[PDB]
Design a protein around this ligand. Structure first.
Ligand SMILES: [Mg+2]
Ligand SMILES: [Mg+2]
Ligand SMILES: [Mg+2]
Lengths: 244, 240, 394
RNA sequence: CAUCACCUCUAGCAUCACCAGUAUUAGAGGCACCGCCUGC
């Protein structure tokens, strides 16, 4: 009793936890075992996460505390194996809190699809996961279609895809903006040699820029015209799925 | 094939043991690793990677005096001959090690950290955080397997609940128990990677044969071909 | 830890026994009656076999603990092949002696006058060196296992020609293939020295004492230097199967019982097989101590006390080019304690008889730079060799 | 063709190759030293 309470507060003091956070960590748990609570806290510290982000992520979701000790230690070994650690895991946690709860093979297929099917470098895979955590939630088939769309139809190579945060954006908005640019003639698909008649607009201009500003910068078309295209493109896409 | 491994000796000794080359051939006799063959003959010097190995009649912390730091052909780093009590054995030398120096080997984990000296062997539970370490082991009694190469050094990132995070030279974190024995400091031959082979002949002196002359269009990205999806199959190549 | 010996090189596990043996009350059918192997029959279990008679060519010794001379306490044996790690410093502690640089004044004063020098001494030593390394054999450059012993036998023979001046050299011989044993304790450590090899100069009269009574009594203030963490018994043959026995090497009645000088030779072609100068002097001290200790025990019994008449034994160790001289005086036989009377040892280190020898002329650009013969010959080195041989006869 | 040099890719580990080795390592490759210039 007393020793269990003494070691919980003592351990958090050793890890640099703030006095307010230590009291909150006791309040965060809902029936969790004391040592099990410490193991979940310590496991996050093992991955290099600072105490301040530790309190924030536990505050949002209490399901992390009520997890088997074996599963998280097995997961944390897998997380560091693929290159996630201090700093990088912080972005993944608040964007994708479901990472710990999701099954291991779901993550394995996602990374293997990038490494084998998409032929992404292991260094590039870690950057994508760190920057774009929506990849894990995304379905494998839709993700694979999104990647090959940029590689073949758009002509974007592997290093540019990782740096430009392409995979995080929705597939639908990519189709709307790219095809409209392609039909406008402003975008030229690279040939077999890779040359283009006209320098294609940079990927940041296409996707990062807002819809209203995107038209003015590159498309040079009015807002009303683009709205009609989206309805036309949606009908073509809807017929495309039914036809195939 | 009638292949018998030369690694048949069962008793440790500091005597250089004659070893026979493989040439990249496995026990079957076929090539399994390419580019290996020939070179100057070498004698293997057995290395005791378990720094904390107290004698049969002794126990606990013990001390060893370095006799000589010499060149080892088998490994990139240099080795040191140390004598503790009535025995002598080979260990992996650190960057700053000379003949006459005294190293300490202990398995004690004190309440507070201790002044870490280069070349000494202490458990990971008694070393200050951030100190460069080398020749680490996964579990107690396993023996040093990581951070062996010349100049390599790990980082004691953190220690929580009897476990410690070790930053490997490949910038990868590893979690092991705090009772693992590690060596303080870097490994010898820091400027080993700064060597210049000079001529193709010196690579044949190290037992490395020239690469195959075939022009391999295959590679990490060139050889492996992403299969185009039927929708994207139309846009793969456009005449120009 | 990492075990030595891969499992492929070890003896394979015997095949699992046939399941017919696991059924009680069932006699297996094996090929033991056919006297040869067949695959469709069970493997018989052969009982252990004994030859039934003693065959020297196929004899197997009993287990080590079954040997009659088996003791739990280990005995560390020092022999000709032992190479001490600390050299002299380790040898001084085992023998409980104090090191004194330089040979004694009395020994060196024998050859101080020109009256005891050999006629044409400088020319005679040069011809001994030249014969050993150039003229000895048909091959141009003889190996060290050939000239190392010869260069020493000739020097002894050269010093043995002074019987004309000193009639007292007719009471000494040179014994080959002589051995000795000596056992003692050093802080509850049973040690034994078994010297062999080299030449043992024997004399009918014991060597006179070197140090006076007051000089011997002044060794009580001296303290032996330690070499922690290295143990004093390192690089020694730790054997549990031994026999504590004192042996001077000769039976009672030998006309030349008292050893005069031990000649040690490092006649090995390979440099690693040759003792280092620090290690060679360590071997000399232990062998000089071992030979002197056997005489003390033979004459004064197997007790442990300060000898009334200390025994002096000389030793000369050479590599064929470098000479080491030792004069060991045994002042006590109670070596268990580190206090009290300690022995004395006069040692000369790294005495070059010649710097280098050219068996062939060095011709550079058709110019003879170095002629055949020794280079850097030091006649002073041979004087020390002559003084030790003339000790006890002048 | 190979070649030092450079560059890419893969791998955090032991009892038959790699290796009785451990990322200053090993393997799969490109190019052909060095020096200058350049991408990012
Ligand atoms: Mg190559
Ligand atoms: Mg090529
Ligand atoms: Mg070429």
């Amino acid at each position: 009793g007393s020793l269990e309470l003494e070691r919980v507060m003592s351990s958090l003091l050793d890890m640099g936890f703030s006095n307010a956070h230590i009291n909150e960590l006791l309040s965060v748990r809902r029936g969790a075992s004391l040592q099990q609570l410490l193991d979940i806290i310590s496991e996050f510290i093992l991955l290099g996460l600072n105490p301040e982000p530790v309190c924030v992520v536990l505050k949002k979701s209490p399901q992390l505390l009520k997890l088997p000790i074996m599963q998280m230690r097995k997961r944390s070994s897998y997380l560091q194996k693929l290159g996630l650690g201090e700093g990088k895991l912080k972005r993944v946690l608040y964007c994708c809190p479901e990472i710990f709860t999701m099954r291991q093979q779901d993550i394995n297929d996602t990374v293997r699809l990038l490494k084998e099917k998409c032929l992404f470098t292991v260094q590039q895979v870690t950057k994508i996961l760190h920057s774009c955590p929506s990849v894990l939630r995304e379905d494998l088939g839709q993700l694979e279609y999104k990647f090959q769309y940029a590689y073949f139809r758009m002509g974007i190579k592997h290093p540019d895809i990782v740096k430009s945060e392409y995979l995080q954006y929705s597939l639908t908005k990519i189709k709307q903006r790219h095809i409209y640019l392609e039909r406008l003639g402003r975008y030229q698909t690279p040939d077999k040699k890779g040359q283009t008649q006209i320098p294609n607009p940079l990927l940041k201009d296409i996707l990062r820029v807002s819809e209203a500003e995107f038209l003015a910068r590159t498309a040079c078309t009015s807002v009303e015209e683009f709205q009609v295209f989206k309805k036309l493109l949606a009908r073509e896409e809807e017929e495309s799925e039914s036809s195939t | 094939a009638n292949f018998v491994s030369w690694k048949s000796r069962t008793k440790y000794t500091i005597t250089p043991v004659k070893m026979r080359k493989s040439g990249g051939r496995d026990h079957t006799g076929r090539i399994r690793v390419h580019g290996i063959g020939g070179g100057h003959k070498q004698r293997y010097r057995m290395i005791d990677f378990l720094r904390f190995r107290p004698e049969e009649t002794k126990s606990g912390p013990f001390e060893e005096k370095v006799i000589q730091v010499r060149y080892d052909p088998c490994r990139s780093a240099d080795i040191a001959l140390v004598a503790g009590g009535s025995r002598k054995r080979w260990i992996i030398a650190t960057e700053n090690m000379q003949a006459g120096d005294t190293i300490l080997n202990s398995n004690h984990i004190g309440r507070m950290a201790v002044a870490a000296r280069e070349g000494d062997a202490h458990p990971l539970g008694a070393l200050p955080v951030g100190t460069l370490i080398n020749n680490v082991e996964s579990e107690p009694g396993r023996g040093a397997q990581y951070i062996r190469a010349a100049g390599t050094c790990g980082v004691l990132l953190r220690k929580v609940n009897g476990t410690a995070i070790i930053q490997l030279p490949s910038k990868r974190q590893m979690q092991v128990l705090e009772t693992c024995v590690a060596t303080v400091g870097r490994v010898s031959n820091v400027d080993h990677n700064k060597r210049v082979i000079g001529k193709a002949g010196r690579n044949r002196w190290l037992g490395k044969r020239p690469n195959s002359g075939r022009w391999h269009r295959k590679g990490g990205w060139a050889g492996r071909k992403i299969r185009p999806l039927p929708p994207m199959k139309s846009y793969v190549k456009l005449p120009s | 830890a990492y075990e030595w010996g891969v499992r492929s090189t070890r003896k394979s596990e015997p095949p699992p026994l046939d399941r017919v043996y696991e059924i009680p009350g069932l006699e297996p059918i094996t090929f033991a009656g056919k006297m040869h192997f067949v695959p469709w029959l069970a493997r018989p279990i052969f009982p252990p076999w004994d030859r039934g008679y003693k065959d020297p060519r196929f004899y197997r010794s009993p287990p080590l603990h079954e040997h009659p001379l088996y003791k739990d306490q280990a005995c560390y044996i020092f022999h000709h092949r032992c190479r001490l790690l600390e050299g002299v410093k380790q040898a001084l502690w085992l023998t409980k002696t104090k090191l004194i640089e330089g040979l004694p004044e009395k020994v060196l004063s024998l050859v101080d006058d020109p009256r005891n020098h050999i006629e044409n001494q400088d020319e005679c030593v040069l011809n001994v060196i030249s014969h050993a390394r150039l003229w000895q054999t048909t091959e141009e450059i003889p190996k060290r296992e050939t000239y190392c012993p010869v260069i020493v036998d000739n020097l002894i023979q050269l010093c043995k020609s002074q019987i004309l001046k000193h009639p007292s050299l007719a009471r000494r011989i040179c014994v080959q293939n002589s051995t000795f044993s000596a056992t003692w304790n050093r802080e509850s450590l049973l040690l034994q020295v078994r010297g062999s090899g080299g030449a043992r100069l024997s004399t009918k009269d014991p060597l006179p004492t070197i140090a006076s009574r007051e000089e011997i009594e002044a060794t009580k203030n001296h303290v032996l230097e330690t070499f922690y963490p290295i143990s004093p018994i390192i690089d020694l043959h730790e054997c549990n199967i031994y026999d504590v026995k004192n042996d001077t090497g000769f039976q009672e009645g030998y006309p030349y019982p008292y050893p005069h000088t031990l000649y040690l030779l490092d006649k090995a072609n390979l440099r690693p097989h040759r003792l280092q100068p620090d290690q060679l002097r360590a071997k000399m001290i232990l062998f000089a101590f071992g030979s002197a200790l056997a005489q003390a025990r033979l004459l004064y019994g197997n007790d442990a006390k300060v000898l009334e008449q200390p025994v002096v034994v000389q030793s000369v160790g050479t590599d064929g080019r470098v000479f080491h001289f030792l004069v060991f005086q045994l002042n006590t036989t109670d070596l268990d304690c580190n206090e009290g009377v300690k022995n004395l040892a006069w040692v000369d280190s790294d005495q070059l008889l010649y710097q280098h020898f050219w068996c062939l002329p060095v011709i550079k650009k058709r110019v003879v730079v170095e002629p055949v013969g020794p280079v850097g010959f030091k006649p002073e080195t041979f004087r020390k060799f002559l003084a030790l041989y003339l000790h006890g006869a002048a």
